[PDB]
């Protein structure tokens, strides 16, 4: 954590130097704006898309690299397994997606930048190819998962309007600083929202919570949001959905500067539900948004398998159990930038170069075990899709680990997940060719690692006695609903080992010591 | 490293060499429009000014010297900008052919908002040049077009371009001819007016209306000028 | 909603395709395009039938991946955003939509609906960049950039690299995006160093992947979905006009690797 | 975001209108002023000149053509004059109405110590206004100033200005209404010739003084001629 | 408009020495006022053009000159001060004989302001 705060200056300064247009003040100099629940003025942004340009200053200066001949690209390719050898991740095993070919890269070094699993929830506001597969596929061949059930959710997500949708489009979660949120009393109403009487509805996180007024935490908001749309509400499209409603506001600030704070996301929310949040109360829902699990890595943002390297969102590394604003982009651009060139290194100068061919035993082993894998996809031929089985899957994990947990549910998910795996495994539909770009075929494949790393996601929240961040368990918080730490039995980073069984991993206790920052 | 020759390396260079030539050329059709509305004044004043053409800057430069540096400039800027816009043409069919659902379609259905400027702009531009060597072999040199003895060639310092003029827009076909290659001028002029200004990088959001404008108001009155001259003279308003 | 769809299949680069009818019989109007492909295909899926193969990533009109010619315009009927921003409340009960991929040269199809758009990787890789390493940026504020340009080259920079303008455009020219890029970085000082290079490069480079001119028609700023206005068009203008003064010449094209 | 329009929005920018008006102004005074330093060569001359104004460039322009854009020009430049200079002078009178010791007066003992400049520019441009009607309205159209039968006025292309200038300095009235804006207008251009590039921002320390010479070698000039003309005519120096 | 905090380094942008001179020149300027006093025409070009020269010769005001000058001329009829005749008053009788050199300084900017099409911003009322 500290490193990390110490090179964001240079990750802002080489940011600046490549060219991202972040906000300026009109003396030509850098201007710097407030998070929510921030007391400082710490971060630079572009107008709303400041993770845009800064992954285009970074996909310039990759164009660069390519160009310099340093760098070989390899778009629409997925690693699809990786290759250890002699103990040493020694290369990965990928598949072309448009002419479906497999191929065998080998390197000295292997570095893991595949992101979150934010995704094995079926309804999130990730990407849509957003998946595991490399850091599962990994964790398979040796890598811990550090803290695999740590995840971070959205408070202000546009919900979907059916089960065909996946994708929740995050909005700011400062919506909640100028919103009431509420649902119609009664179970069943047809009357517009704006036509309901202040009477009728159901103003809760005012009602209940009198505390935290107004500012509610994302976690115990989301959670009420999620409890009240789970007992029936019928307000969005398939009931999910809750009114943050903006008509008292609007009604005490100025419209014109409601507009200034608020009017790209009106209009982005306006365009994708067809609903103008100036008239009616606007509708939101939780959707998980950040994994701050993944692979455990030490110091040197080295895996438990020498020379794979894991960075960004794809390892645990210093999110800790909640990951603060601004600082999943700072992670990425610091292991980037400023760290992991020193620890490849130190790596790579202790090793020979070269010695590890593509015609390798272990090359092979893998390849064939992508090939089995892709022909037996191909030729269960069942009656559901794969998009039926994530569904399923990210319904579970959503009610059983999502952001409310507990021991029963947490178990009655790692009974059903299983089943489900089986029932993937014999009754899924995968049309199409293995040499062509089959997409479901993609789909098919993330599927099929996301419900082997959900089991191991469920038995961490299940082990894990105790709520840090945005793990909670019902068991262990406080009368006003807040997490609450056992410090002394579980101060530390819990790393899962693949012991070849899927419901009997590993745990690898790594102890946290605080001697700057106690823990209160 | 070879200068402004450079130009001639990039596709954007050739456009902004088609600017410039199309600069001269219309800085030279607005002066012959100009021009030729003499010829409503009579034929006194019309052949007193084709006269004076060739005896331009007398005093100080020989006969026909200022109208050849002008003829040689504007033979050059033609020679250029068919050129270039060969080459564009040929740049823009190539990237087409690949993605195309035939050979003449592009889409099964490309809706246009910004207008067919790509269609008139290359059709008139054939049809002009068509025109242009038509043109020069009508009025200039009287070999097509002309009855036998209809057609008098300037003979020392008298010119009988009135006489030309009246007797070539008699047959209805060159009247045709030259009113439908005034309207695809006319939408020349209109496109490339404000699009010589772009090309070469003198226009913004605040100059966007005001080129679209003198455009308009260049390419306006060209075309009732370069159709007025051929319709008067055919329906007898010039004799 | 009952929707009749006219979706290009194409089964490879090499193998010719053709529009094939399929009929939807409910719509929901707050579904987006791209749900309710994905809901076609799930129907075809389920039929037996190959499904549509289009890109996506995002769904938000950010990453760009989303490229679909729908009923004539990039990007669907309504302009300013992407084929994921656009929804089913823009059409009609019995409308025909008409799906395509993009058309040009320089933008092979792969599938249905899928393009490879490495061109524009190859115009980037071809100078659309700072050449600043990593460790040798002085600090933030030492070189002010003024709020108006600083606005600019965020209009400028605000292009997710989608090829609509490529596809709008007549001549299926890279004119807006290559623009936009050199827009962006010539607005900054930092941009200044190498920009009447990076220019002349960037062109060449369009030059060379097979994209057409501009003839200044402009439907790259109709459809685009970030509304990046001709005034880039107008500076990349500007700037080659001053490089070819400068006698500027075009480095080796970026050869596909 | 109106562009150069934007010169209206402000006091500074409406002196730069004036500024360049007052560029066109002097450049049509002095060239006038060069143009009826003629009369001296004779009736013959005169005419000649007055003539070769309407038939500028003749063999390529029409008659009157190149006059009547000079004319259009100047129209232009005395009204955006004017109403710059009268939106200027309210906007000092305001702000010098609220603290004054009377309508007439501002201090009760103000030494000026850089000149006069804004009194006589005021006075001498009210004056050269009028000046400019009434000799519109006596030289060009002869409808003032003139006994009946003394106006000749142009018919076909011979001119009789020598004439109407002869006849036209007759009454001493006339003659020292002349005088007087000539004084006024040697004040205005002995201020306005440097006041035009202090204004565009064209003036340093170091050619202060060479603006401030030319703009004084120009207002004499102007001055002697324009005074040479009416006491040469009255005197019967020309006849 | 530089915030407390974000200044760079005070030797990293290099002023030339004559350009330093010059903008002292200008910026000694103690807003007494008899700019407007002995104006004909009250006028505070004098002290507008000594400040807008004093920003507009120094690379940090240079960000923001062209609008500056534009807004600081509108302010100045906005207040109720008359237009320059050029009289030259002011600068005899400035306490710190600020030229007018600065009064063309100004009029050089305010003419490429309106070349880039620069709009005065809403004036700056009394409280
Ligand atoms: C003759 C040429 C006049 C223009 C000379 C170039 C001036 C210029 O700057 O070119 C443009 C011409 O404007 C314009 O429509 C001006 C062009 C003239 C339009 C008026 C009608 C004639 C305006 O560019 P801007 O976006 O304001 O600034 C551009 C800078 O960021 C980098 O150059
Ligand atoms: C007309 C030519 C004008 C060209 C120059 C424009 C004005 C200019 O720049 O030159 C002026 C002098 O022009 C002048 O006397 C020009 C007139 C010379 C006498 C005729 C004064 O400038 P300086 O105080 O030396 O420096 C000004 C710089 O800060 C530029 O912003
Ligand atoms: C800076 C370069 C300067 C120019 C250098 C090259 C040009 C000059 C040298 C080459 C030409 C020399 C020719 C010299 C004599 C020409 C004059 C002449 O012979 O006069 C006759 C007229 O001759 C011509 O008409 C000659 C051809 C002139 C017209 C050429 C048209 C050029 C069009 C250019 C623009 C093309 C389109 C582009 C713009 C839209 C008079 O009539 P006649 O005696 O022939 O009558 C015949 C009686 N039976
Ligand atoms: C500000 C400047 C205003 C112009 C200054 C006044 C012009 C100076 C000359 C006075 C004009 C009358 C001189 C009479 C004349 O032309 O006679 C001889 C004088 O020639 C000279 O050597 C003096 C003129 C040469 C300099 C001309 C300067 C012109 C400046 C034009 C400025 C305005 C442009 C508009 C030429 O011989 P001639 O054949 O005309 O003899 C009399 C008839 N047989
Ligand atoms: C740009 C568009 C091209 C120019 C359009 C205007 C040119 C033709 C104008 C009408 C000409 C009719 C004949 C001349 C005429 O009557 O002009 C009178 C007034 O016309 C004007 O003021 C015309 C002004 C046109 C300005 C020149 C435009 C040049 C365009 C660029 C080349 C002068 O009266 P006058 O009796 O002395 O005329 C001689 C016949 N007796
Ligand atoms: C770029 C714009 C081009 C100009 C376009 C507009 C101008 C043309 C259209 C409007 C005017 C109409 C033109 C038609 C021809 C008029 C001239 C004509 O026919 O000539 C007569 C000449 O008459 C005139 O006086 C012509 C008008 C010129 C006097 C106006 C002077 C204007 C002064 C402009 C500057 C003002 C002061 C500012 C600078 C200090 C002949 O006299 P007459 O024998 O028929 O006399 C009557 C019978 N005895
Ligand atoms: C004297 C007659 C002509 C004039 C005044 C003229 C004027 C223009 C102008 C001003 C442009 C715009 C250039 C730019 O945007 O930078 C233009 C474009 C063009 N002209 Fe011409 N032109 C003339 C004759 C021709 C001829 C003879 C041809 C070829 C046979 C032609 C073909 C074109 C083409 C193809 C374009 C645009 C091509 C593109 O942008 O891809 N024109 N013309
Ligand atoms: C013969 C035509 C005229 C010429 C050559 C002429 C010339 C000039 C010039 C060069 C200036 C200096 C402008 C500047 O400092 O930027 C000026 C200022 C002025 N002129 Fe004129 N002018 C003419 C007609 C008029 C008329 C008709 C009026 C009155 C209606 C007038 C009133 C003024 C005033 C009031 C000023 C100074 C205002 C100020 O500086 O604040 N002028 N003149
Ligand atoms: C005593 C000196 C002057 C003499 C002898 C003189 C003589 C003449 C004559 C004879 C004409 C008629 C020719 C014509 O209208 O085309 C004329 C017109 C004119 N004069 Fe003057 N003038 C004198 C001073 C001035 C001054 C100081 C101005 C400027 C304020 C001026 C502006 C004009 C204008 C605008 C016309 C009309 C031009 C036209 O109609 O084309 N004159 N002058
Ligand atoms: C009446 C005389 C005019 C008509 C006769 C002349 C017509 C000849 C032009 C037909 C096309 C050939 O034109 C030729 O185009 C090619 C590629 O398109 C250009 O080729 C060059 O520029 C293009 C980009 O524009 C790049 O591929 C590269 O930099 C280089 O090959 C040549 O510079 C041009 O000479
Ligand atoms: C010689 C005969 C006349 C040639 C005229 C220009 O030549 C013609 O230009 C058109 C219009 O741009 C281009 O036509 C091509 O591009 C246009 C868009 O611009 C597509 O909509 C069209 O489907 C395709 O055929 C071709 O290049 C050529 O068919
Ligand atoms: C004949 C020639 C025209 C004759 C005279 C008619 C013109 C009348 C001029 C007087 C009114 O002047 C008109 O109003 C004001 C002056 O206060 C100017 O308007 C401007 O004034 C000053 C700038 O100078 C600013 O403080 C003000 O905010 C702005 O509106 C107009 O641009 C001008 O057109
Ligand atoms: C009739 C119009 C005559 C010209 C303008 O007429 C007059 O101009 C003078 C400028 O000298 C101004 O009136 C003047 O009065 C005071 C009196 O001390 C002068 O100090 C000051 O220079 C000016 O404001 C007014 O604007 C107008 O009353
Ligand atoms: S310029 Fe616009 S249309 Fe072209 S790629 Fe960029 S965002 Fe897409
Ligand atoms: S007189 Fe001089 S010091 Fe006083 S306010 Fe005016 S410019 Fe400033
Ligand atoms: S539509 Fe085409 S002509 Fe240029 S401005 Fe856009 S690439
Ligand atoms: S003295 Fe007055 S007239 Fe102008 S130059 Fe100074 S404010
Ligand atoms: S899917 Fe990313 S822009 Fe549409």
């Known amino acids: 954590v500290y490193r990390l705060a110490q090179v964001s200056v240079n990750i802002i300064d080489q940011c600046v130097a490549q060219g991202v247009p972040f906000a300026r003040e009109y003396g030509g100099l850098l201007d710097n704006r407030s998070f929510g629940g921030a007391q400082v003025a710490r971060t630079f942004y572009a107008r709303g898309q400041t993770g845009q340009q800064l992954l285009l200053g970074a996909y310039q200066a990759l164009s660069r690299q390519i160009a310099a001949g340093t760098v070989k690209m390899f778009p629409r390719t997925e690693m699809l397994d990786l290759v250890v050898v002699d103990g040493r991740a020694r290369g990965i095993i990928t598949r072309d997606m448009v002419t479906g070919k497999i191929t065998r890269y080998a390197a000295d070094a292997v570095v893991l930048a595949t992101g979150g699993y934010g995704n094995v929830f079926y309804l999130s506001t990730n990407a849509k190819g957003c998946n595991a597969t490399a850091i599962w596929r990994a964790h398979r061949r040796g890598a811990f998962f550090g803290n695999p059930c740590f995840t971070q959710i959205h408070p202000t997500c546009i919900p979907v309007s059916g089960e065909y949708q996946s994708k929740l489009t995050l909005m700011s979660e400062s919506l909640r600083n100028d919103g009431r949120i509420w649902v119609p009393k009664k179970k069943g109403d047809t009357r517009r929202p704006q036509d ?49 409603d903006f008509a008292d506001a609007i009604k005490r600030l100025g419209r014109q500067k409601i507009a200034e704070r608020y009017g790209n996301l009106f209009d982005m929310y306006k365009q994708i539900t067809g609903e103008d949040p100036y008239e009616t109360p606007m509708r939101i829902y939780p959707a998980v948004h950040y994994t701050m699990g993944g692979l455990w890595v030490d110091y040197n943002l080295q895996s438990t398998i020498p020379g794979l390297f894991v960075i960004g969102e794809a390892n645990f590394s210093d999110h800790g159990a909640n990951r603060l604003g601004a600082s999943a982009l700072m992670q990425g651009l610091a292991d980037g930038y400023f760290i992991l060139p020193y620890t490849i290194a130190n790596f790579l100068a202790q090793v020979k170069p070269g010695g590890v061919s593509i015609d390798r035993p272990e090359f092979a082993e893998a390849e064939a075990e992508i090939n089995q894998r892709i022909q037996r996809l191909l030729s269960i031929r069942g009656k559901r899709t794969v998009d039926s089985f994530h569904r399923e899957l990210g319904k579970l994990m959503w ?7 507990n021991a029963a549910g947490l178990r009655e998910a790692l009974q059903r997940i299983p ?19 089959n997409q479901a075929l993609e789909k098919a494949g993330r599927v099929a690692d996301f ?26 918080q406080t009368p006003d609903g807040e997490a609450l730490r056992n410090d002394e039995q579980f101060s530390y980073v819990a790393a899962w080992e693949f012991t070849g069984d899927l419901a009997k991993p590993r745990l690898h206790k790594e102890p946290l010591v605080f001697e700057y920052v106690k823990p209160t | 490293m070879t200068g402004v020759l450079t130009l001639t390396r990039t596709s954007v260079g050739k ?8 600069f001269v050329l219309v800085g030279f059709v607005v002066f012959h429009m100009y021009g030729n509305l003499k010829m409503y004044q009579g034929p006194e004043v019309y052949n007193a000014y084709a006269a004076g053409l060739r005896e331009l800057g007398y005093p100080i430069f020989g006969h026909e010297h200022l109208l050849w540096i002008a003829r040689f400039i504007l033979l050059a800027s033609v020679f250029l900008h068919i050129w270039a816009a060969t080459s564009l043409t040929l740049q823009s069919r190539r990237s087409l052919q690949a993605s195309s659902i035939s050979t003449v379609r592009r889409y099964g259905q490309h809706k246009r908002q910004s207008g067919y400027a790509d269609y008139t702009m290359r059709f008139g531009g054939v049809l002009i040049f068509f025109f242009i060597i038509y043109h020069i072999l009508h009025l200039t040199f009287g070999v097509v077009g002309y009855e036998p003895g209809q057609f008098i060639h300037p003979h020392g310092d008298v010119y009988e371009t009135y006489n030309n003029v009246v007797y070539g827009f008699q047959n209805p076909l060159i009247v045709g001819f030259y009113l439908l290659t005034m309207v695809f001028l006319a939408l020349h002029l209109y496109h490339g007016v404000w699009s010589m200004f772009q090309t070469l990088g003198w226009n913004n959001r605040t100059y966007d209306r005001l080129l679209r404008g003198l455009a308009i ?23 | 909603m009952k929707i009749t769809l006219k979706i290009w299949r194409q089964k490879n680069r090499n193998t010719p395709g053709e529009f094939k009818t399929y009929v939807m019989d409910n719509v929901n109007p707050d579904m987006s395009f791209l749900e309710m492909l994905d809901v076609l295909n799930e129907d075809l899926m389920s039929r037996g039938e190959e499904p549509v193969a289009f890109d996506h990533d995002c769904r938000e009109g950010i990453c760009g991946m989303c490229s679909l010619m729908i009923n004539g315009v990039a990007h669907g009927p309504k302009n300013a955003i992407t084929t994921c921003q656009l929804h089913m409340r823009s059409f009609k009960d019995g409308d025909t939509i008409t799906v395509e991929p993009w058309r040009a040269s320089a933008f092979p199809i792969l599938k249905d609906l899928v393009v490879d758009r490495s061109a524009f990787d190859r115009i980037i890789q071809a100078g659309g960049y700072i050449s600043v390493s990593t460790g040798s940026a002085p600090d933030a504020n030492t070189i002010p950039v003024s709020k108006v340009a600083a606005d600019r080259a965020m209009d400028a920079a605000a292009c997710i690299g989608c090829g609509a303008c490529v596809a709008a455009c007549p001549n299926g020219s890279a004119m807006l995006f290559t623009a936009a890029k050199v827009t962006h970085l010539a607005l900054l000082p930092q941009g200044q160093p190498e920009r009447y290079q990076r220019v002349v490069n960037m062109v060449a480079q369009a030059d060379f992947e097979g994209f057409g001119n501009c003839t200044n028609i402009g439907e790259c700023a109709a459809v685009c ?9 107008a500076q990349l203008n500007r700037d080659l006009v001053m490089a070819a003064l400068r006698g500027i010449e075009p480095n080796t094209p970026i050869v596909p690797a």
Request: glycine share 10%; hydrophobic share 40%; with cysteine.
């Open chain 1, 196 to 244: 309901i009487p202040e009477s009728e509805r159901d103003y809760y996180l005012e009602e209940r919570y009198p505390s935290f007024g107004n500012l509610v935490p994302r976690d115990i908001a989301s959670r009420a949001a999620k409890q009240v749309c789970d007992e029936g509400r019928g307000v969005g499209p398939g009931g999910l959905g809750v009114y943050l």
């Open chain 3, 225 to 233: 979905p970030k509304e990046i206005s001709l005034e880039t068009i």
């Open chain 1, 451 to 476: 419900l082997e790393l959900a089991e191991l996601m469920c038995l961490d929240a299940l082990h894990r006695e105790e709520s840090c961040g945005g793990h909670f368990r019902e068991e262990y």
């Open chain 1, 399 to 405: 009610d059983k680990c999502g952001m409310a947990r």
């Open chain 2, 15 to 22: 456009k902004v060499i088609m600017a410039l030539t199309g």
């Open chain 1, 419 to 437: 089943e489900i795996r089986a029932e993937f495994w014999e009754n899924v539909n995968v049309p199409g060719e293995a040499n062509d770009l």
């Open chain 2, 217 to 239: 108001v260049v390419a306006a009155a060209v075309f009732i000028g370069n159709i007025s001259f051929p319709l008067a003279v055919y329906f007898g308003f010039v004799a």
